[PDB]
Write an enzyme that holds these catalytic residues in place. Structure first.
Site, PDB file in Angstrom:
ATOM      1  CB  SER A 257      -2.347  13.743  28.204  1.00 50.68           C
ATOM      2  OG  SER A 257      -4.096  14.815  27.621  1.00 50.68           O
TER       3      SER A 257
ATOM      4  CE  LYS B  51      -4.388  -1.476   1.868  1.00 47.31           C
ATOM      5  NZ  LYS B  51      -4.123  -2.650   1.185  1.00 47.31           N
TER       6      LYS B  51
ATOM      7  NE  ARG C 202       0.865  11.140  29.636  1.00 46.24           N
ATOM      8  CZ  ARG C 202       0.504  11.099  29.201  1.00 46.24           C
ATOM      9  NH1 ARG C 202      -0.663  10.504  30.120  1.00 46.24           N
ATOM     10  NH2 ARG C 202       0.384  10.910  28.182  1.00 46.24           N
TER      11      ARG C 202
END
Ligand code: NA
Ligand code: NA
EC number: 2.7.7.7
Length: 327
Positions: free
Chosen positions: A174, A66, A177
DNA sequence: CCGACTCGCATCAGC
DNA sequence: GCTGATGCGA
DNA sequence: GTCGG
């Protein structure tokens, strides 16, 4: 890596991933394409051929072919075709509505319901979740800047402590974080009265208070240990109204709390790495517990955990700050 | 050649 | 009515 | 679709 390196390839693979999940209902092919998209997105060189990419873990023969076609032509015939397919593109699109998965999307399209307008005309064919997802379709696809997350955290931590000052709440994802933006808010909640060997209203209390001060606006689902719903910051002055946001709230037993915090802090790749290193040391770590493996392989009773650090210690590792946890 | 790749809640399928 | 399966999102 | 037992 700059997006312009292999962005055409990764976009191609991500789009293929979506049609597998949403139209073909092949969840493992969906994750296969994503894994290929991820590992290529981290590749620090512009790919010259499918053979080059095949060297990477997660990229096999078919994707290599591909990439060869995309590199030589700038497109994919199969992707080009399914793009202009009315049925498949409509099915794929409708799944962007929260609550509408591959199955519901298929049934809607089967009976001629293809667009948001078609959805808005047939509300009585939607369940409660799907109506909420429809109502906030635009808002749910917007990201949340950290400043708004910080203000959302202010309200949550305040109202939680107001209900019972012995609650413990931690906003994970997140955001913990230290990310510049978030997709939603994930709150983890515990209480000294709630253990594994242990009231079934501790979650309701908190949800109710956040509703009382008009922070929580809608409810997608709610049980004794898990809430999924919608919230919104109060509008300032005569300023423009804030977007409605997705917020989850989980009630976790005290003795399983910090395993949960770690797991829902992430990142996934970090959690993957950490789980791999957990194994060789002879420990098994999941969302709930860390367990000791017998000499054959028999997991003994879960080890006492009183902090995130405790976990890191068990596997003789040193505490990594949430900001240092992308890998 | 061929199997691998967890769970809470809402709602369906069936008894 | 209840139990178990399925869809969905996490 | 990819990996590997
Ligand atoms: Na490969
Ligand atoms: Na959806």
């Amino acid at each position: 890596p700059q997006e312009t390196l292999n962005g055409g390839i990764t976009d191609m693979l991500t789009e293929l991933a979506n049609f597998e999940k949403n139209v073909s209902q092949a969840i493992h092919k969906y994750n296969a394409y994503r894994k290929a998209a991820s590992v290529i997105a981290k590749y620090p060189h512009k790919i010259k051929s499918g053979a080059e990419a095949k060297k990477l873990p997660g990229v096999g023969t078919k994707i290599a072919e591909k990439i060869d076609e995309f590199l030589a032509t700038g497109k994919l015939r199969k992707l080009e075709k399914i793009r202009q397919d009315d049925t498949s593109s409509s099915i794929n699109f409708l799944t962007r509505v929260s609550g509408i998965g591959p199955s519901a999307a298929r049934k809607f399209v089967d009976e001629g319901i293809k667009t948001l307008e078609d959805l808005r005309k047939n509300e009585d064919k939607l369940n409660h979740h799907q109506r909420i997802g429809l109502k906030y379709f635009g808002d749910f696809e917007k990201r949340i800047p950290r400043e708004e997350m910080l203000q959302m955290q202010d309200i949550v931590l305040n109202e939680v402590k107001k209900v019972d000052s012995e609650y413990i709440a931690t906003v994970c994802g997140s955001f913990r974080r230290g990310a510049e933006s978030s997709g939603d808010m994930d709150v983890l909640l515990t209480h000294p009265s709630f253990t594994s060997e242990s009231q079934p209203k501790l979650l309701h209390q908190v949800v109710e208070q956040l509703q009382k001060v008009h922070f929580i606006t809608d409810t997608l689902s709610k049980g004794e240990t898990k809430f999924m719903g919608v919230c919104q910051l109060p509008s300032k002055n005569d300023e423009k109204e804030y977007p409605h946001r997705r917020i989850d709230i989980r009630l976790i037993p005290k003795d399983q709390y910090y395993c949960g915090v770690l797991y829902f802090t992430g990142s996934d790749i970090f959690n993957k790495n950490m789980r791999a290193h957990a194994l060789e040391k002879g420990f098994t770590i999941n969302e709930y517990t860390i367990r000791p493996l017998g000499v054959t392989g028999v997991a003994g009773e879960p080890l006492p955990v009183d902090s995130e650090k405790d976990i890191f210690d068990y596997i003789q590792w040193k505490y990594r700050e949430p900001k240092d946890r992308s890998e």
